[PDB]
Amino acid sequence: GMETLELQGAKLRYHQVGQGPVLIFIPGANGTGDIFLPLAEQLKDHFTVVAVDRRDYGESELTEPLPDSASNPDSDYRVKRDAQDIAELAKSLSDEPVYILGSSSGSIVAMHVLKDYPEVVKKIAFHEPPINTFLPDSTYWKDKNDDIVHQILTEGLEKGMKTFGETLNIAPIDAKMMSQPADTEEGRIEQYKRTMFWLEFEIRQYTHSNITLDDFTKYSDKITLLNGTDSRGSFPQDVNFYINKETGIPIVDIPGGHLGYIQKPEGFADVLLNMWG
């Protein structure tokens, strides 16, 4: 049971309890306002307490995708959008400037609220801010954070890729090609992220989707099943053999493995041309 404020690109959800001046709590790394709710119990006699789920977290939901650039460590999109969210929330809840407390990265949102929308701040508390930009050694801390994040994300993706590799039962010609890594750290990372997306959002949904053999017999005349010559014994060939066994739909052998259309493009083309020429 949370309140909603619809904003450009997101539905912002927040908790609210109590009476008095508005006091907005901006969460840090956990992103959600439930973490303030025991504190809110202590304050509801003297403040109208508002604990926000920031738009990328919790019960808040995006209505437009994040820009592709938000993964750049130099992007200012999210922090500025979060600060605008707090300012429009303040404005919906009172006509007088409100109290604001942010913790950790949420204290950084708070600082951007004060910088860009000072008119909404009556008083503000920055609880243990980890901002480094104005520090004498800001370049060191920025580089250190960047190395830490890269290490965490890289080790997690590498473990996922290693475990994926442990399950793979694939043909040698495909394994050669599947092992070719991109030429930059960023491109390898993108390959890993793409694999993780396919695993979570595609393989189960598509391989158990609603197709029956009756869907194929209705138009059997249009269909050709293709098995690679270099991928024999693999599970997808067994699928084609079953379709063919039960429908009579023809199997055509074609050069290469599961990736035969890039392994042996000339031979693959020759078969397609025979099939459909």
Residue list 51-110, contact with Ca ion (CB under 5 A):
61
With contact defined as beta carbons under 8 Å apart, do 234 and 258 qualify?
yes
SS3 87: helix
92 vs 232 by CB, closer to its own copies: 232
Residue 195 CA to its chain's centroid (Å): 13
CB of 18 to its own copies, least distance (A): 12
Query: Nearer Cβ to its own copies, position 95 or 180?
Result: 180
Considering the complex, what minimum distance in angstroms separates the CB of residue 59 from its own copies?
Answer: 11
Half-sphere exposure at residue 107, Cβ-oriented, CA atoms within 13 angstroms: 11
Number of chain positions touching Ca ion (CB under 5 A): 3
Q: Could you give the 3-state DSSP secondary structure of residue 62?
A: strand
Contacts for 82 with CB less than 8 Å, ≥ 6 apart: 26, 54, 55, 109, 112
- The site partner of 164 among Ca ion, its own copies, none (C-beta below 5 to 8 Å per kind) is its own copies
- Least separation in angstroms between residue 136's CB and Ca ion is 8
Per-residue binding string, Ca ion, 125-144, x by CB under 5 A, is -------------x------
Smallest separation (angstroms) from its own copies to the CB of 218: 8
Contact between residue 254 and residue 271 where contact means Cβ atoms under 8 Å apart: yes
- From the list Ca ion, its own copies, none, pick the one residue 33 interacts with, judged by a Cβ distance below 5 to 8 Å according to partner type: none
Contacted entry of its own copies, Ca ion, none for residue 159, CB cut-off 5 to 8 Å set by kind: its own copies
Residues 142-181 close enough to bind Ca ion by CB under 5 A = 158
Of 27, 9, 146, 106, the closest CA to residue 66 belongs to: 9
Helix (H) or strand (E) holding 109: helix 105-116
Please, are residues 53 and 60 in contact by the beta-carbon 8 Å criterion?
A: yes
As measured in angstroms, the least distance from the Cβ of 60 to Ca ion is 6
Residue 114 binds which of its own copies, Ca ion, none (CB < 5-8 A, kind-dependent): its own copies
